[PDB]
Amino acid sequence: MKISKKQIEYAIEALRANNIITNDNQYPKVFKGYISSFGAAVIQSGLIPAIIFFENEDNDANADRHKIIGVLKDIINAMRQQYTVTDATILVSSQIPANYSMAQYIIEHGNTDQLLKEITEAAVAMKLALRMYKSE
Amino acid sequence: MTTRMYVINTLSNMHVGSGEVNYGVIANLIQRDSVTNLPNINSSGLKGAIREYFKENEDLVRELFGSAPRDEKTLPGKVRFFEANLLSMPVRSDKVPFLMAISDEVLQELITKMKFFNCEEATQYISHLSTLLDNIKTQAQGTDFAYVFDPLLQGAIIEEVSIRATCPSHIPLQPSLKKLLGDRLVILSHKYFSILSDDNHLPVLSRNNLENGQSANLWYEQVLPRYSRLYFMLMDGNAQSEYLKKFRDTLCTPSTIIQIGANASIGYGYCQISELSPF
Amino acid sequence: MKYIAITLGPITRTIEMAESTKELWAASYFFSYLAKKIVEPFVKKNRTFQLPLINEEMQKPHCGAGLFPDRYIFKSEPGDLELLKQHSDQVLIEIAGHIASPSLPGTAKDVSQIYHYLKSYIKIYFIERTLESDDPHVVIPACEKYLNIIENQETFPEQEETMISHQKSDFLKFLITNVNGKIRFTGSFLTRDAFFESILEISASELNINIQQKALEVITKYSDQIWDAEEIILNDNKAQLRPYHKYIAIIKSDGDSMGETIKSMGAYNIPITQLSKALLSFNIESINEIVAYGGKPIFIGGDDLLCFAPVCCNGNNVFNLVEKLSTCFDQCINQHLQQYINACSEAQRPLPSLSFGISITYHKYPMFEALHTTDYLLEMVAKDNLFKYTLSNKNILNENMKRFILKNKLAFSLQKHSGQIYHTAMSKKGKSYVKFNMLLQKYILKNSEKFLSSVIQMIRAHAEILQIILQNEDKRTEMLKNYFDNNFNESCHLGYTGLFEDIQTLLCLRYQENIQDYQNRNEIIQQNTILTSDEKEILIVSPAMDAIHTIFTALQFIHFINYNKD
Amino acid sequence: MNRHYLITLTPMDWFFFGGERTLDDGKSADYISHSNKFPQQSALLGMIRYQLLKQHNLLSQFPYTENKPTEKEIMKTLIGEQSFRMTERKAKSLGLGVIKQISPLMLIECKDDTSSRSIYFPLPLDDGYKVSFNETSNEDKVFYNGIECPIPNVYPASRKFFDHKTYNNYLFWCTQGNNQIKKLLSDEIWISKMQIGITKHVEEGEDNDKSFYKQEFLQLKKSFIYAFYITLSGESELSSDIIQLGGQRSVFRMEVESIEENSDIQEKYQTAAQFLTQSDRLLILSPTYVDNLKELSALCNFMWSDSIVFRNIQTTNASNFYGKPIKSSSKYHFLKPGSVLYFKQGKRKEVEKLLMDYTYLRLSGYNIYI
């Protein structure tokens, strides 16, 4: 899983878009742990349980943990764009609607192999891009 | 009797050292064709490997490959070896462990080289290969393609470039083409084949040197995946019939295994050479 | 009145027909010797000279480099051309006699036929020209214009007989091969006019160990045996032998836009004698400080310099040697061209400087390939001749692209014993060079700031992320600091905060200089309508990745110097 | 009466032509070999002789067999006595049987269809440069290691002067166009490859002392072939086959095309080169040898020339062929294709006479000009 620069730029834009990075280039310190733990949760619990856990907004978390799921969706949508559209391509370049939650989308669209790969790569990009900012 | 095509059909992972200066991470890289940037084996490497296999036959080696280095007799070799080009390479799939990947441009180059060398019994091969290529181009209609020839293998996924292999139910694959190009054969564009055989996709291995538990050295090696198929043309000059016959029979015998590559003691580069068949 | 102009010898061909350290020294000093004894008459009898400052101690041997370029235009008197011609074949005759001195391991010696070969090979061209004007800054361009085109004639040595016994028709080979001689060394007329061999003795000139003496004792034709003797002597000198004691650095430098500087001084009514003064003083100081550092001067005291130096002696780098050479050249330029300095630099102009080419290779891996690599680094990388050559081949060139030509650059490659090249180029103008030199001084251990080796692989692996951070203009320094802090965020890394911030500042400075030098150039190259994509790709230099690669190569050089195989 | 053939050589793989430095000489750096772009015309002669006896089945096979006194004069009437001995350059005949005339090797672009063959020539050293010689005013002469020479003035023929930092006519090759010259760079015609070679040396007790060499192999671009013209008497049908043109087993496809017998090949080559002629020049098309270049310099206002090296393998009919090859006794310095000799007023016939006095060289394909 080599560093994909385009996915890093996608992660930067999505982190700014989902109100994680402040105008001064700082973020709540707990988000580091959120990004780090999401990959482990996906690997050793399953993609749907991990997404459901991190998408919940009724959590007793020190910050808005659900922002990372929105950033994930933004990175995935950016990757669906700039997909080489051809008859032979496996990848579905259909953008995830904003009204649908991420958990529903994987539930309704039952081809998890593409979604799992995209979510794993987007999480790696998230963790690598969070290091450009101050860890306040 | 003049020019015969041979297929290499490696049984292990090959590493043929390019010996060139390195700009990057992998300290040891494999040889590639200068123009096509496709993996290749130099004619010197093939000659050395086959000579080492036949070293116990002094007369055969002297008659076919020539005099040994720093021998005063200065005997040229009656056999000319041509560069080995990559024909088919294994590609990771999901329906099956691997797939035999042959690109349309490598097929065109094979047809062109067969016409240029006028290989033995190559007329029917060229005609049928050209029919295959024309039918493939007709079905493709200028778009990127991935074509399999088994109804079971339809819908196979090439993991690295993420393309699904369709089955053209209007194109025939003759049995000799299966014997030449390989089993579980997929035909794809050279655009995908270049990605599948570049320095970022073919295997890279980390290797260590330990001294009482202390890592003395570290480096990386890249290898050609096993079961890869390479073809080279052998120009049998007008030589002794008996030595040529013995060499051809020994090479074609299924009991023969030839090591072309670097890491011999760790089983790199063992191959099974087969000549072109009728049809 | 008229002037007489001189060009001397097919120097590049003579260099190519030679492979040894003795060879490289001998060809250059043979041409310098020819210059000395061809201009001895016109200088012993006083003639107002304006091309070199041929006075002081140039005729005096300093250490042996040759201070005489082959660009001579005197003043003229009625009847000096015949003087020049008869003394030209006379000096050729004395050279033929000099080789005909049985002081070398020769077998049979001729005089007349050796002289015939030497005349048919050595190109000694005189230009007489009625320049109806009294001004040097106009005289020099007008006569160099003609001597450049005159240099396109070819002198044929028709036929040589070089196989066996005593009948070969080439003799420059012995004049250039068996310099010095039999063993206590003997000398040739080169050595008499001069006052050091193999490849390893000046790579490990720090242990205060005299390998020449012990090697001579062991050996008592020549070069191979003494090469092997030196090799195994510093092989069993393993006790204090570091990996940089077996690596050889070749330094090649040339003056940047000398003719352009001459033309700029002509506008401000400034004599070329000041430029001659500065060049000669720089050459003398260069020889002095090169022998002081621990290396060897080989080639010339003109506007070039080929030096064979060890990578590190007495805690001094080859990069320290390059910095001292650049400082010496700048000091001489400022001291003598002070008028030009404070007259053309106020409004705007780049001052004359020297581009540098450094090659560091094993003591093995023969020095012919290393010399060609050094030539490539100096010419096509340090002097930006790739850009100019590629554009001139396709007949684009033109003034818009010519103004983007960059000079005053240092290019160096390090080929470790394996085949891994570490090659970068950086500008010696600006703060990036001084930060680079200070970093090398800082983190290279003496015989005590600590160096981290895992930052090196972070630079390589995270190069794309560093490119994004560098391209983010507004918060580049902040983002770089945050990245270097979030990575290396462990307890052991608190002791290397100085290294991290030094790397960050050097990288930012390198990126700024890179963008200033290359951004418009790359944009206009991209728009060019006849360039092939291959040429565009080999010509478009990414500002950020080049800075990242420069920092990476600097760090790897520091690690390569520091780490011993223990 | 004589029969003329056009022989085209198509490379089947990477080739190499040896220069003065070969991989196993006694000199210092005998592990790097660089490849000349063209074979020597002596290599062409040896090619033709080898194929000629191949068709007639007369070779040496293994021991140093001797030939009975019928094969001896059949080889006399087939190829002659010796190889291309440069010693007999002033001989008014080819010293070889059957073979009478060999044209200088030509670079031919065969693109598609029958169409036409585009003969490629090196750029004359003054392509877009107008040389303006002595405006006769008794002043401002030059000494070219010798006697008077009248101060060449080179302008960009399109003012400024000759700037040598932007001179690249020696990196270009040229061919006929629709009244303009088509210029091809040298690196587009040829591709260079450096090969690393070793002896694996496995065994037990061998000295690993010389087991490393570097070889330079060149590849002609796809639509590019070598060709030359031959003249044969006592007709031996030179057939198409697989040939060797020297250098680490270099293989070429020989195609033999017959042309009209009432045609000398020399003016065919000069008709190909006609598009590069100027009245004031002498464009050197093939390497040119003169025993005394001082005379040639004395007969011209400029020598915009270059030097090339010649060394031939000397072998007779009764030669070993299987041992160390006795190479030529002298390395000879020829001019380079593209060199130009700027003669003075008149004296053009004199320099032509000087150049043409070597008839062996002219018949072999050397000393050809336009």
Ligand SMILES: Nc1ncnc2c1ncn2[C@@H]1O[C@H](COP(=O)(O)OP(=O)(O)OP(=O)(O)O)[C@@H](O)[C@H]1O
């Ligand atoms: N003593 C001297 N005084 C003045 N000029 C000198 C002296 N010695 C040499 N020169 C000048 O050096 C020039 C040769 O420099 P060179 O050709 O190596 O570099 P350049 O063309 O100026 O640089 P670049 O290749 O970077 O554009 C000659 O034109 C000559 O006038």
Ligand SMILES: C[S@@+](CC[C@H](N)C(=O)[O-])C[C@H]1O[C@@H](n2cnc3c(N)ncnc32)[C@H](O)[C@@H]1O
């Ligand atoms: C003389 S001009 C170039 C002309 C070139 N030397 C020739 O012979 O045509 C300046 C260059 O010549 C070279 N040069 C001049 N004098 C030299 C000398 N004595 N030894 C070696 N190289 C010399 C250096 O490369 C320098 O940059």
Ligand SMILES: [Mn+2]
């Ligand atoms: Mn210079």
